[PDB]
């Protein structure tokens, strides 16, 4: 089993992740990420944008099954985070998602 929270923390600590819908979309447009993670309650059209561009640039996208409050909280942030890009998984096996 993969523990999402453990892997997100491991990737955040030892790799590089970029946070936010707008950056995630931009990374998707550019092919500059290995994985894109979106929250279950991300605005559907934000979710569509990401999927559309990530399919075009060949980036895998994963839906975290929790909300964007929890995603931001997992990341140590006092606000919601509805998506994020894994640019470098670091030591994690997060790209298995």
UniProtKB/Swiss-Prot annotation:
What GO annotations for molecular function exist for this entry? RNA binding; structural constituent of ribosome
Q: Give me any GO biological process, just one.
A: translation
A family per Pfam: Ribosomal_L7Ae
Q: Any S-S bridges, and between which cysteines?
A: none
Q: Which GO terms describe its cellular component?
A: cytosolic large ribosomal subunit
Q: Which UniProt keywords apply?
A: Ribonucleoprotein, Ribosomal protein
Q: Which InterPro entries does the entry link to?
A: Ribosomal_eL30 (IPR000231), Ribosomal_eL30-like (IPR039109), Ribosomal_eL30-like_sf (IPR029064), Ribosomal_eL30_CS (IPR022991), Ribosomal_eL8/eL30/eS12/Gad45 (IPR004038)
The UniProt entry's sequence similarity note says: Belongs to the eukaryotic ribosomal protein eL30 family.
User: What NCBIfam families does its record include?
Assistant: PRK01018.1
Its name, as the record gives it, is: Large ribosomal subunit protein eL30
Q: Which organism is it from?
A: Thermococcus celer
Q: Which gene encodes it?
A: rpl30e
């Amino acid at each position: 089993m993969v523990d999402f929270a453990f892997e997100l923390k491991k990737a955040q600590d030892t790799g590089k992740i970029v946070m936010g819908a707008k950056k995630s979309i931009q990374y998707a447009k550019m092919g500059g990420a290995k994985l894109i993670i979106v929250a279950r309650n991300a605005k559907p059209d934000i979710k569509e944008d990401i999927e559309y561009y990530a399919k075009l640039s060949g980036i895998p996208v994963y839906e975290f099954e929790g909300t964007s409050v929890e995603l931001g909280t997992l990341l140590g942030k006092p606000h919601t985070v509805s998506a994020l890009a894994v640019v470098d998984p670091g030591e994690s096996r997060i790209l298995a998602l």
